[PDB]
Structure formats: C-alpha cells, structure tokens
C-alpha cells in the first residue's frame, strides 16, 4: 500500500495535462484548479502534476514517498546528516492529518517523506 | 503490482548509495557494481541508483509500469510521435522478457514505461 507519488511541476499545466489524459491516457482523478494541481492516475499508478547534469539534479520533481515509521525515520536523519533536512517534520491536516519532512540528497533530489 | 520506480543519475555512486542506506535506512535489494547500477527499497517502496527551466527532471528515469503497452505505444506514435525517446523494443535477460519505450512529456520529464510477459 506504500509508494512513492511522484509531484511534477508543470511551466503550463493545460499543456502538461493534454499530454498526460489525450496523449498517455491518463485519467484525472482529482484536482484543486485554483492550485493548477492535477492528481492523475494510469490503472493505479499515480503522479501529480502542479503548475507553476548540474547540480541540483531531479529540478521540478518532488517524491511523495509514503513511509512506515515517519518519526524514527525523522530522528534517524537529524542524527546522522542533520544538514540533509530540506523541510522540517510537520503536521499537515485537511481531521485528516499527514505528518511529513522533506530531504535533500546529495545529487540534489528532492524526498517529501510522509505518512498519514 | 503495478509501480513507477525512480532512477536517479548520480555523480558518486558510492556516495548516494552510502546516504540512501545509512541516512535513510534503505536497503540494497541487487546490484549490477560494473554498471554502478544498484536497486534499493524502503519497506517495499523502491527507487534505482545509476552512477526552474526546460527541459525538467534531469537525471531522473521514471520506470512506469503498465498493463497494454502496445496501444499506448501506437497512441503516442500517432498523436505525439516527436515524444518518443527511445521506441518500442522488447528487452530480454536469461528467457524473460520486458517491453519497453521511453517518451518525454513537454516539461522535459523522461518515462520509461515497462510491460513484463
């Protein structure tokens, strides 16, 4: 149940969301227009999409990347490269709540750790 | 059981390995050392280690998993074939098979999507 949700930016989200639903027969399963925000989906398999080699690699990607243990995993990293820490550990609620950090790796990929 | 599987581009192989595993507790699941390929997973998630302006997403490979990947491959050569990266090719290891195509979406992003059988 656990996976990784992929955030694109989008430079023109009309133009990013053709190419996916028309050309990858993606379909829409939700989305906040006022955002630009798209969450769209190929028989289970999700991504996002939100309008807006040299380090930092991976620019315009962010990986929603669903975890187990989100506090162990928070003092895990502030232990060994504090420094790593891209977004401090947060609770985002909607109550649904999703607790959630970011990290930066040393190629420059970008992690939103999360877990609701 | 389908996935999509991140590959990242790395400049020191040994260096992200290193973080991936000690900093983020993944774990190496196989590697291929003469390609400085390693495949890692954290709790069944995983993601492929390989040693704002367009195009978007350098150094990253989406492997997307998919069920028909012939008439998808058919609908992007028909509306969209300028997209196409790398065309339609069955890839095949000691005999297991895999079919695959890459494409890039306007912003610059690579997918590799894979059919297994």
């Known amino acids: 149940t656990l996976r ?17 639903v028309d050309v990858l027969g993606f379909e829409v399963k939700y989305e906040r227009p006022d955002e630009e925000f798209v969450y769209l989906t190929l028989d289970g398999v999700d991504v996002m999409l939100e309008g807006i080699l040299e380090f930092p690699l991976g620019s315009g990607v962010n990986f929603q990347w669903d975890v187990i243990d989100i506090e162990p995993l928070y003092q895990r990293v502030n232990e060994s490269a504090a420094d ?4 401090a550990l947060e609770s ?13 790796t040393p190629d420059g990929y970008l992690f939103r750790f999360c877990q609701d």
């Open 4 to 20: 990784v949700v992929p955030e694109l930016y989008c430079f023109d989200i009309n133009v990013s969301q053709s190419f996916f």
């Open 84 to 87: 790593s820490i891209y977004l």
């Open 92 to 104: 985002k609620s909607y109550i649904a709540t999703q607790k959630q950090f970011m990290v930066q």
